[PDB]
Structure 1
Amino acid sequence: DHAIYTAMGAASQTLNQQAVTASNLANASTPGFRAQLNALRAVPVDGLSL
């Protein structure tokens, strides 16, 4: 029932990464521009059992 939230987080962060990439591509003609890197970090939830 909570794997849906893991997948939803993955999809939302994929949307965020796509937004970053689109913002980078929109500035292909911007003078003296530095592209923003993107990386998906993994956060492990620390409960007791598994």
Structure 2
Amino acid sequence: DHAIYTAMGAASQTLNQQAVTASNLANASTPGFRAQLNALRAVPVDGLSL
């Protein structure tokens, strides 16, 4: 019942990464521009039992 939230987080962060990439592509003609890197970090939820 909570794997849906893991997948939803993955999809939303994929949307965020796509937004970053689109913002980078929109500035292909911007003078003296530095592209923003993107990376998906993994956050492990602590707790019990497995």
* TM norm structure 1: 0.99
Unaligned runs of at least 5 residues, structure 2: none
- Work out the percentage of aligned pairs sharing the same amino acid: 100
How far apart are 1:49 and its partner, in Å? Answer: 0.6
Q: How many residues align?
A: 50
In the alignment, the residues of structure 2 paired with residue 38 and residue 22 of structure 1 have an alpha-carbon distance, to the nearest angstrom, of 12
TM-score normalised to structure 2 length: 0.99
Instruction: Give yes or no for the alignment of 1:6 onto 2:10.
Output: no
Deviation at 1:20, TM superposition (A): 0.0
Q: CA deviation at 1:48?
A: 1.8
Tell me which stretches of 4 or more aligned residues in structure 1 moved more than 2 Å: none
Alignment deviations for residues 9-41 of structure 1 (CA, whole Å, 9 cap, x no partner): 000000000000000000000000000000000
CA-based RMSD of the aligned residues comes to 0.3
